[PDB]
Amino acid sequence: LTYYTPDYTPKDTDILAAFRVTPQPGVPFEEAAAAVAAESSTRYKGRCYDIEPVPGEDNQFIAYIAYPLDLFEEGSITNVLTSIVGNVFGFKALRALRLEDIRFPVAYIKTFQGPPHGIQVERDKLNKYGRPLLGCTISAKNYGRAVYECLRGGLDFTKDDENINSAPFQRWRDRFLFVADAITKAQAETGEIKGHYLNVTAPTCEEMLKRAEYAKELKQPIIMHDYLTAGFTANTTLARWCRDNGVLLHIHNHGIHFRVLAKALRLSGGDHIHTGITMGFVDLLRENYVEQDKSRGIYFTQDWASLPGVMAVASGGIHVWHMPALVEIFGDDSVLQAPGATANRVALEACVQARNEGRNLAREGNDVIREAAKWSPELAVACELWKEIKFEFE
Amino acid sequence: LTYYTPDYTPKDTDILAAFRVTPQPGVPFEEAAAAVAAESSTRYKGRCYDIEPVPGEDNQFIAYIAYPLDLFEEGSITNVLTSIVGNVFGFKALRALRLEDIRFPVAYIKTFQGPPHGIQVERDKLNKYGRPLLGCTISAKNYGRAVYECLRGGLDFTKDDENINSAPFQRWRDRFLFVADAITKAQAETGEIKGHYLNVTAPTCEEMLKRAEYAKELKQPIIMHDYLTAGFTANTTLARWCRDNGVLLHIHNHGIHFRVLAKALRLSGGDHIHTGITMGFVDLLRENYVEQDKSRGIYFTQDWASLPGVMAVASGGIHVWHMPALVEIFGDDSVLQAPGATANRVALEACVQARNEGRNLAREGNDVIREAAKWSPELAVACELWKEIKFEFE
Amino acid sequence: NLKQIAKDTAKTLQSYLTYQALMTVLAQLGETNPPLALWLHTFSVGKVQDGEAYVKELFREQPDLALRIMTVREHIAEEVAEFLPEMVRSGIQQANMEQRRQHLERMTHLS
Amino acid sequence: LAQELLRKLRQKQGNWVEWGQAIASLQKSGYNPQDIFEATGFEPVQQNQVIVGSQVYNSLEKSGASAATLAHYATRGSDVLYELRLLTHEERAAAGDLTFTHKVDADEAREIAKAIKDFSRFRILPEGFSNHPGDAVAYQAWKLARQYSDLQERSRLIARGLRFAHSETARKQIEQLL
């Protein structure tokens, strides 16, 4: 019971966690929180210093646990995510347990090196400035001929997603050429430089070292893979292949909330990750200082203290007509997903100038799409395909 | 004049300097300090926030200059010592200028890795615990025969100091064997393990890489060189040869005070450096937290925040009879400089037990040397050779 | 989920209940102040939804009649809106009887 | 003869909105931005800040701002007016006056333009506040200061809370914190 001292202010340099706890019947709120701060670690012990409740929800309370600075290894996300929640999810005295937040200190953030490339550094080889990006998911020659005609409508890149590895009908080597030979025939014929994002996933890593040394020999743009079925350990052998090459940046009741998973992933690395609370972590990946917003999931306060930002990816689905709704919410510094590709670039580029006139793009969004049909035939088709469903039942 | 804002508190994370300034006649105290904080650097500017004077001394004043955090490179002592005092010593508007102190933040100290070995880590291969150390300075065979009989009196190591490199009478290779062959004949015959500290200094560094790979092949103890006629750049190629080997730790009106030179040298590396104010930096090399002692030269406050300590070397000269005066002042965790060598170990080992009885070793120091003569004939000779000079003229 | 639904339902029918507010005022002022009904009918045509945020625009030009629209949220929302529970599910069973019959109308056409 | 807009730049002729408008002329005559930097010293990253600034300053004197705001934002104060880009035509000149008096920097007027954004995103005015941006940034500085239950932590948000609060009813809400 020396693991619960509410007479204590957590220091300037402490590591500092939260937990949205839910106990079994009759279990007090003050012993479940000492059942968390003690069984995490083992002056070397975490101490639950606050016990705040949650209004109008199933019996939760917010436990504020404060681990010291020296308890952990400098520059490691695996250690921080494992010495904290190792065997704390495995109790039967709790109905649920989530990990809502972590404050890293200023002293421990700048041990890490972070994302290799930021909101500034991305614009060097990427020839797009001040406007968000576009990119759509896609035998072996016929597969190369299809990305040959998606980038020719405005797509800033494309995606070799849905897990295309070397199968006996389509090998790994004969997919790289035919979507390298398909970039050399759309770079000059459209006036911009485009990539095609390609999987590097192999059984070993020695084979994965050959699926990433062949890709960029000097051949090819910035080309990515995932974090699931992989770790912060698996993607450390190749996120630090961007420390030589600048080549892989896109990362594609009872849990751990995404804003803990997003602190773990900026500090690991990468330039634009896939995903009030939707506005919440996208003001953690992009901001410098964030003050405590309890109604946003942002329960703490930590300045990022001069470390490279990281943008966001659109995560709702196909969005061809619902274009100005994304432009306000994710802002300028984000990334979004041949007739069907030329309708995408036109609806994006149009709204951005009607924002800068001063027109309220929230209360006017559809009419900006409609005026862009009178010089673009591919937006004449799309607006009729999408949904005008309403209710005027007052 | 935006380089002097005394309406400002320096932050938790600022880098923070002092200067004992002395200006020309008629030069005000408020424009000489803006002549320092501005010409150092160039929100990106240092600001002299305080202007405190010095009582009873030649017109000095203490200038407190506060540079931001981001201004500097993580983990570099060359940058910090050069972007601060580059062309600030070169004014004619000042009669003198010294750099008395630097506060590093907590956030910037733990970017550095520090000394490889500390007050804890030194005792692994060094077989001496809880009592300070001893070591005395020394053709080619006849040179090897002399260290062959200094370590056989109690010297924990010896010193190949006074700049013995390969001359045409005594080459570099034929000095290493004969003071390696002289360790193998005193390790077993005295019951302890002893080193002989050897110079690695070469013209190139490719030759210096051969004067340190030959020394410890697996042959030989922890073997050092200097910092002068060398840099924090020269001794970074070989202080990080201790990141593989554990082998080189001893570092052997108008200026920069030594406590700035000692912050620069712990953080660079090394386990025991050579040198109220004599007590001052030896409570910076050894302590964790130091509160502001203006009468000790310690003008700031910074916790070292869990980083390895570093001991001190005796710097007054030959001390054979003046042994208990050093044991109190440098304490336990320090290092000090065959009949003439057996008198050294006996006078050291005797006082340490008369401290632990409770006898006041300050007001009793000579009588502990005198009682140790009645079982040691080499202390019978030495106490008569040294000085009993007094004055009873009251 | 359902709380996403139920909080969306809470504002929709509310705006419908603030319409029967405005219609009760509408038939009331056709008998007391026929100039005030002919001017209330002028503002009524303006196609403005969101009955809660519709009464706020009434306070902008006329801060007084917007209280009488609000008045029946305590008075007529008790004889209209608490009778909803026993009067939805009865109509659900009727639609379970009106619409199951036409599965038989095709079946007799298939007979 | 659009080459006389190439001349008025490397001679430093005018002030920054005079270049902020002469770019958008040349950006309507078939110019690639990449080659604009070859004869004029401004890369279109640096031109990007004065396009949008003159797209604001033509709305600043339009929407009824005062004289001194339209005197100093003719000559200096560049990147603050780039940060008011996410507003509309109606509330920028109310904030161009307010971010002149406090002499705020780039990052502070970044967040003031964010605070007036959410205060005008609302369908409802909250209690004790009006349409002025001095009430906008003093509403957030009070809404995020209710959550502390400590006296010597909230005065960081009360000194700034007493720095902006415009109407007297918005001054009383800050006074309840004390």
Coordinates of C-alpha atoms in Angstrom, one line a residue, chain A residues 25-214:
Chain A
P25 CA -18.1 -6.3 -8.0
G26 CA -17.1 -5.2 -4.5
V27 CA -13.5 -4.5 -5.6
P28 CA -12.6 -1.0 -4.3
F29 CA -11.3 1.7 -6.5
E30 CA -8.2 2.1 -4.4
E31 CA -6.9 -1.4 -4.4
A32 CA -7.4 -2.1 -8.1
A33 CA -5.1 0.9 -8.8
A34 CA -2.5 -0.5 -6.4
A35 CA -3.0 -3.8 -8.3
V36 CA -1.8 -1.9 -11.4
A37 CA 1.1 0.3 -10.4
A38 CA 2.8 -2.5 -8.4
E39 CA 2.5 -5.5 -10.7
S40 CA 3.8 -3.4 -13.6
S41 CA 7.3 -2.7 -12.3
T42 CA 7.9 -5.4 -9.6
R43 CA 12.4 4.5 -4.8
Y44 CA 12.1 2.2 -7.8
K45 CA 8.3 1.8 -7.8
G46 CA 5.4 3.4 -9.6
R47 CA 2.8 5.1 -7.4
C48 CA -0.8 5.8 -8.4
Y49 CA -1.2 9.4 -7.3
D50 CA -4.7 10.2 -8.4
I51 CA -8.0 8.3 -8.6
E52 CA -10.4 10.5 -10.6
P53 CA -13.8 9.0 -11.6
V54 CA -15.7 9.0 -14.9
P55 CA -19.1 10.6 -15.0
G56 CA -22.1 8.7 -16.6
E57 CA -20.3 5.5 -17.7
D58 CA -19.9 1.9 -16.3
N59 CA -18.0 2.4 -13.1
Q60 CA -14.7 3.5 -14.5
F61 CA -12.1 5.5 -12.8
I62 CA -8.9 7.1 -14.1
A63 CA -5.7 5.9 -12.5
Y64 CA -2.7 8.1 -12.7
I65 CA 0.5 6.1 -12.3
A66 CA 3.9 7.7 -12.1
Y67 CA 7.0 5.5 -12.8
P68 CA 10.5 7.1 -12.3
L69 CA 12.9 8.2 -15.1
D70 CA 15.7 5.7 -14.5
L71 CA 13.4 2.7 -14.6
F72 CA 13.7 2.3 -18.4
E73 CA 16.2 2.1 -21.3
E74 CA 17.0 5.2 -23.3
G75 CA 15.5 5.0 -26.8
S76 CA 13.2 1.9 -26.7
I77 CA 9.5 1.6 -27.3
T78 CA 9.5 -2.2 -26.9
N79 CA 10.7 -1.8 -23.3
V80 CA 8.2 1.0 -22.5
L81 CA 5.3 -1.0 -23.9
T82 CA 6.4 -4.1 -22.1
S83 CA 7.6 -3.2 -18.6
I84 CA 4.4 -1.2 -18.2
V85 CA 1.7 -3.6 -19.5
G86 CA 3.4 -7.0 -19.2
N87 CA 1.2 -9.0 -16.9
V88 CA -1.3 -6.3 -15.9
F89 CA -3.9 -7.2 -18.5
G90 CA -3.9 -10.7 -17.0
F91 CA -5.9 -10.2 -13.8
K92 CA -9.4 -11.6 -12.9
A93 CA -10.1 -8.8 -10.4
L94 CA -10.8 -6.4 -13.3
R95 CA -13.6 -6.6 -15.8
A96 CA -11.6 -4.4 -18.3
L97 CA -8.5 -2.3 -18.5
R98 CA -7.3 0.2 -21.2
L99 CA -4.2 2.3 -21.5
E100 CA -5.4 5.7 -22.6
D101 CA -2.2 7.9 -22.4
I102 CA 1.5 8.1 -21.7
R103 CA 3.5 11.3 -20.9
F104 CA 7.0 11.0 -21.9
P105 CA 9.2 13.7 -20.3
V106 CA 11.2 16.3 -22.2
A107 CA 14.3 14.5 -21.0
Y108 CA 13.3 11.1 -22.5
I109 CA 11.8 12.3 -25.8
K110 CA 15.1 13.7 -27.0
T111 CA 16.9 10.4 -26.4
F112 CA 14.9 9.1 -29.4
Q113 CA 15.7 10.1 -32.9
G114 CA 12.2 10.0 -34.2
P115 CA 10.7 10.0 -37.7
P116 CA 13.5 10.4 -40.3
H117 CA 11.5 12.9 -42.3
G118 CA 8.8 15.4 -41.2
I119 CA 6.4 18.1 -42.3
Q120 CA 9.4 19.9 -43.6
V121 CA 11.6 17.1 -44.8
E122 CA 9.0 15.3 -46.9
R123 CA 8.8 18.0 -49.5
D124 CA 12.4 17.5 -50.7
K125 CA 12.0 14.6 -53.1
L126 CA 8.2 14.7 -53.0
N127 CA 7.3 17.5 -55.3
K128 CA 4.0 18.5 -53.6
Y129 CA 3.8 21.5 -51.4
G130 CA 1.0 23.0 -49.4
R131 CA -1.7 20.6 -50.7
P132 CA -2.4 17.0 -49.5
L133 CA -1.7 13.9 -51.4
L134 CA -3.5 11.2 -53.4
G135 CA -3.0 7.5 -53.9
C136 CA -5.1 4.4 -54.9
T137 CA -4.6 0.7 -54.3
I138 CA -4.1 -1.7 -57.1
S139 CA -0.7 -11.8 -63.9
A140 CA 2.5 -9.8 -63.8
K141 CA 2.6 -7.7 -67.0
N142 CA -1.2 -7.0 -66.7
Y143 CA -0.6 -6.0 -63.2
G144 CA 2.1 -3.6 -64.3
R145 CA -0.2 -2.2 -67.1
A146 CA -2.8 -1.2 -64.5
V147 CA -0.6 1.1 -62.4
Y148 CA 0.6 2.3 -65.8
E149 CA -2.8 4.0 -66.0
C150 CA -3.8 5.0 -62.5
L151 CA -1.0 7.5 -61.9
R152 CA -1.9 9.2 -65.2
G153 CA -5.0 10.9 -63.7
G154 CA -3.4 12.7 -60.7
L155 CA -2.5 10.0 -58.2
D156 CA 0.6 11.1 -56.3
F157 CA 1.4 7.5 -55.7
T158 CA -0.3 4.0 -55.7
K159 CA -0.5 1.1 -53.3
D160 CA 0.6 -2.5 -53.7
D161 CA -1.6 -3.3 -50.8
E162 CA -3.8 -6.3 -50.0
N163 CA -0.7 -8.5 -49.5
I164 CA 0.8 -9.2 -52.9
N165 CA 3.9 -11.3 -52.3
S166 CA 5.6 -13.7 -54.7
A167 CA 3.1 -16.3 -55.6
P168 CA 3.7 -19.0 -58.2
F169 CA 1.7 -16.9 -60.7
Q170 CA 3.3 -13.6 -60.0
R171 CA 6.9 -13.5 -58.6
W172 CA 8.5 -10.7 -56.6
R173 CA 11.1 -9.7 -59.1
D174 CA 8.8 -9.6 -62.2
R175 CA 6.5 -7.2 -60.3
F176 CA 9.2 -4.6 -59.5
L177 CA 10.3 -4.0 -63.1
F178 CA 6.8 -3.7 -64.5
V179 CA 5.9 -1.0 -61.9
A180 CA 9.3 0.6 -62.4
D181 CA 8.9 0.5 -66.2
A182 CA 5.5 2.0 -65.5
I183 CA 6.9 5.0 -63.6
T184 CA 9.4 5.9 -66.3
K185 CA 6.4 6.1 -68.7
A186 CA 4.3 8.5 -66.5
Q187 CA 6.9 10.8 -64.9
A188 CA 7.6 12.8 -68.1
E189 CA 4.1 12.4 -69.7
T190 CA 2.3 14.1 -66.8
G191 CA 4.9 16.6 -65.5
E192 CA 5.3 15.3 -62.0
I193 CA 7.1 12.6 -60.0
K194 CA 5.1 9.6 -58.7
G195 CA 5.9 6.5 -56.7
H196 CA 4.3 3.1 -56.5
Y197 CA 4.3 1.9 -52.9
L198 CA 5.5 -1.8 -52.8
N199 CA 5.5 -4.5 -50.1
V200 CA 8.9 -5.7 -48.8
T201 CA 7.5 -8.5 -46.7
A202 CA 9.5 -11.8 -46.8
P203 CA 9.8 -14.9 -44.6
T204 CA 13.3 -14.1 -43.3
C205 CA 14.8 -10.7 -43.1
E206 CA 17.8 -11.7 -45.2
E207 CA 15.2 -12.1 -48.0
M208 CA 13.6 -8.8 -46.9
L209 CA 17.0 -7.2 -47.2
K210 CA 16.9 -8.3 -50.9
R211 CA 13.3 -7.0 -51.4
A212 CA 14.5 -3.5 -50.4
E213 CA 18.0 -3.3 -51.9
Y214 CA 16.6 -4.4 -55.3

